[PDB]
Structure 1
């Protein structure tokens, strides 16, 4: 396991602690979010991020950050602002980026 894999696994653990319901733990299904796949072109979730770390697909912290932001932007695109999902996404986006400096 490489230094980047170790750091990104660390960051991912810390970020998932901010989502205790696991709303971001797995790909959003169309069953839970009607029409999701037709609206969101590039889905992302923490579980996919973990698989990408294990597969050694991230070669920089920038790339990991970009996936994290994608995940949050998707939730802010799909959901109305008055929803737990939009608010959580916005919160964890800023906290996450700070956390990761």
Structure 2
């Protein structure tokens, strides 16, 4: 388990704790989110980001942070501003980057 693997494993638990309901835990589907895959071209979530961590696919902190901002962005785009959903993404996004600095 590489040093980069320990840092990211740490950042992940730190982020995923900002999201007590699991909104981000798992890949969204169009069943649960109508027309989702006809707006968001590169989908993301925590559970995917965890699986790449394990897989050693992240060769730096910068690339882990790009997935985070990918998953945050995706949500602000799909969801309306007045939603629980867009608001957690927008909050968690600016905190996240700072925490990881």
Q: Does the alignment reach a TM-score above 0.5?
A: yes
Q: CA RMSD in A?
A: 0.5
Q: Deviations over 1:54-88 (max 9, x none)?
A: 00000000000000000000000001110011000
What is the Cα deviation at residue 29 of structure 1? 1.0
TM-score, structure 1 normalization: 0.98
Between the two proteins, the alignment pairs up a number of residues equal to: 101
Aligned counterparts, 1:1-101, within 5 A: 1-101=1-101
What secondary structure sits across from 1:23 in the alignment?
A: coil
Deviating runs (4+, > 2 A) in structure 1? none
What is the Cα deviation at residue 32 of structure 1? 1.1
Structure 1 CA distance, aligned partners of 2:96 and 2:34?
A: 27
What is the Cα deviation at residue 19 of structure 1? 0.3
> What residue ranges of structure 1 are gaps of 5+ in the alignment?
none
TM-score, structure 2 normalization: 0.98
> What residue ranges of structure 2 are gaps of 5+ in the alignment?
none
